[PDB]
Design an enzyme around this catalytic site. Sequence first.
Site, PDB file in Angstrom:
ATOM      1  N   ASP A 179       0.830  -1.220   0.000  1.00  0.00           N
ATOM      2  CA  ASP A 179       0.000   0.000   0.000  1.00  0.00           C
ATOM      3  C   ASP A 179       0.853   1.255   0.000  1.00  0.00           C
ATOM      4  O   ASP A 179       0.319   2.343   0.266  1.00  0.00           O
ATOM      5  CB  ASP A 179      -0.975  -0.036   1.176  1.00  0.00           C
ATOM      6  CG  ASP A 179      -2.244   0.764   0.918  1.00  0.00           C
ATOM      7  OD1 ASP A 179      -2.648   0.843  -0.236  1.00  0.00           O
ATOM      8  OD2 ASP A 179      -2.855   1.238   1.912  1.00  0.00           O
ATOM      9  N   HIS A 218       7.870   3.463  12.734  1.00  0.00           N
ATOM     10  CA  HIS A 218       7.292   4.799  12.804  1.00  0.00           C
ATOM     11  C   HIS A 218       7.307   5.481  11.414  1.00  0.00           C
ATOM     12  O   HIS A 218       6.244   6.028  11.035  1.00  0.00           O
ATOM     13  CB  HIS A 218       8.078   5.588  13.841  1.00  0.00           C
ATOM     14  CG  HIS A 218       7.655   7.004  14.027  1.00  0.00           C
ATOM     15  ND1 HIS A 218       8.172   8.044  13.279  1.00  0.00           N
ATOM     16  CD2 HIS A 218       6.835   7.565  14.945  1.00  0.00           C
ATOM     17  CE1 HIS A 218       7.671   9.180  13.740  1.00  0.00           C
ATOM     18  NE2 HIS A 218       6.843   8.921  14.731  1.00  0.00           N
ATOM     19  N   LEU A 259      -1.460   4.288  -0.897  1.00  0.00           N
ATOM     20  CA  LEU A 259      -1.994   4.269  -2.279  1.00  0.00           C
ATOM     21  C   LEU A 259      -3.491   4.151  -2.329  1.00  0.00           C
ATOM     22  O   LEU A 259      -4.117   3.540  -1.485  1.00  0.00           O
ATOM     23  CB  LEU A 259      -1.370   3.101  -3.026  1.00  0.00           C
ATOM     24  CG  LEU A 259       0.134   3.205  -3.269  1.00  0.00           C
ATOM     25  CD1 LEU A 259       0.651   1.862  -3.858  1.00  0.00           C
ATOM     26  CD2 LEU A 259       0.485   4.365  -4.178  1.00  0.00           C
ATOM     27  N   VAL A 312      -5.281   1.192   3.683  1.00  0.00           N
ATOM     28  CA  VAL A 312      -5.815   2.527   3.971  1.00  0.00           C
ATOM     29  C   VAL A 312      -5.603   3.403   2.745  1.00  0.00           C
ATOM     30  O   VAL A 312      -4.980   3.020   1.757  1.00  0.00           O
ATOM     31  CB  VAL A 312      -5.101   3.139   5.218  1.00  0.00           C
ATOM     32  CG1 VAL A 312      -5.444   2.351   6.505  1.00  0.00           C
ATOM     33  CG2 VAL A 312      -3.538   3.154   5.043  1.00  0.00           C
ATOM     34  N   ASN A 347       4.998  15.862  22.150  1.00  0.00           N
ATOM     35  CA  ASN A 347       4.028  15.173  22.983  1.00  0.00           C
ATOM     36  C   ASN A 347       4.297  15.469  24.463  1.00  0.00           C
ATOM     37  O   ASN A 347       4.179  14.555  25.302  1.00  0.00           O
ATOM     38  CB  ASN A 347       4.140  13.661  22.778  1.00  0.00           C
ATOM     39  CG  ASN A 347       3.810  13.217  21.346  1.00  0.00           C
ATOM     40  OD1 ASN A 347       3.102  13.935  20.605  1.00  0.00           O
ATOM     41  ND2 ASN A 347       4.226  12.046  21.016  1.00  0.00           N
ATOM     42  N   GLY A 384       9.948  21.932  15.348  1.00  0.00           N
ATOM     43  CA  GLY A 384       8.651  22.566  15.308  1.00  0.00           C
ATOM     44  C   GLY A 384       8.635  24.003  15.810  1.00  0.00           C
ATOM     45  O   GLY A 384       7.935  24.860  15.278  1.00  0.00           O
ATOM     46  N   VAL A 435       9.090  26.619  10.473  1.00  0.00           N
ATOM     47  CA  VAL A 435       8.516  25.277  10.415  1.00  0.00           C
ATOM     48  C   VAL A 435       7.069  25.352  10.917  1.00  0.00           C
ATOM     49  O   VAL A 435       6.745  26.096  11.884  1.00  0.00           O
ATOM     50  CB  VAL A 435       9.354  24.336  11.343  1.00  0.00           C
ATOM     51  CG1 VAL A 435       8.724  22.941  11.425  1.00  0.00           C
ATOM     52  CG2 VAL A 435      10.791  24.201  10.840  1.00  0.00           C
TER      53      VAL A 435
HETATM   54 CA    CA Z   1      -4.902   1.694  -0.255  1.00  0.00          CA
HETATM   55 NA    NA Z   2       7.185  26.728  14.055  1.00  0.00          NA
END
Ligand code: CA
Ligand code: NA
Lengths: 63, 281
Positions: free
Chosen positions: B41, B64, B75, B81, B155, B169, B174
């Site tokens: 996929d 991950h 896909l 999915v 997190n 981040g 970003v």
């Molecule tokens: Ca698919």
């Molecule tokens: Na930022």
Amino acid sequence: KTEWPELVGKSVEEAKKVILQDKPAAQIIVLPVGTIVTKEYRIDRVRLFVDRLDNIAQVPRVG
Amino acid sequence: AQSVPYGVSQIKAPALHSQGYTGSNVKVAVIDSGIDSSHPDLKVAGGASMVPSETNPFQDNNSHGTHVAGTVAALNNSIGVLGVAPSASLYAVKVLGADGSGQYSWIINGIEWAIANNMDVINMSLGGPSGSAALKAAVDKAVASGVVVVAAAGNEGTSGSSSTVGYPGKYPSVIAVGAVDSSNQRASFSSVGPELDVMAPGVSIQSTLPGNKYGAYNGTSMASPHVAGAAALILSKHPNWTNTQVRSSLENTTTKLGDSFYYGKGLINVQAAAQHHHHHH
Ligand SMILES: [Ca+2]
Ligand code: NA
């Protein structure tokens, strides 16, 4: 209990022992402080970030 | 039969798909733990590894990076999915090893590879609590060069009035992405702070896992690729839009949620972002 600020500055060995008393099914992974890591959230995991002396360098937390 | 994970629907990606836009010809670097290129996929177009002991970017020893890649680009077919941008050209830029960690220089080397290889979008589902000048310079260079750069906010949950958004981040260049659930509630682990830009689904996100598997993961890692995939959808509908314009289109068309310290600008809505005229719903 999900964070252990009292373990900062302790040995990685004592941190492991303490975390496993509070959370015996914890998946503990030891990583160098100052690395970048994946940002998935794993309720079973506690990453321990250590300095070059193998002391805890950041507050351990679940995730 | 194929399933559409709820988060793909929640950000309104099917409205782009129905218009005919699926990320075709947009190059997206998943800067992560690798991508399992044998997954039926996924279609991995290329990549490179910056991890000294894991030279193959197409083997994901963690899982991950494969999960993140499936949210960007699983896909469109009769299996598994559906990705946000299922026609994107997907690049595995391995900068994290099996244990989920990498050195700052490995991440920087992957960002530089992405710039040199003309990536349109970078997803970084990764972070650490400290920055570095060299990390900031690499993300700033990618953005100056025209790349849309998206990262997980972190997190780290809350800490009173303090920002808990991590790097990269936290850098202004970003787009930092926090996590909501299917009810638009902030996940308790989602980092907070004035640097939080937008939110996307990050709870119980089904995607591809190595060895032809699928599974539900949680994290701002899962929210970031919804936004990277949305950027690829927008560029496939507006191929001349700059990264500046893609970023503003996403920011200017969110569904506003709570206070911006906790929710940033709210949940992304790629349908509204990819119109010419932008407003919040
Ligand atoms: Ca698919
Ligand atoms: Na930022």
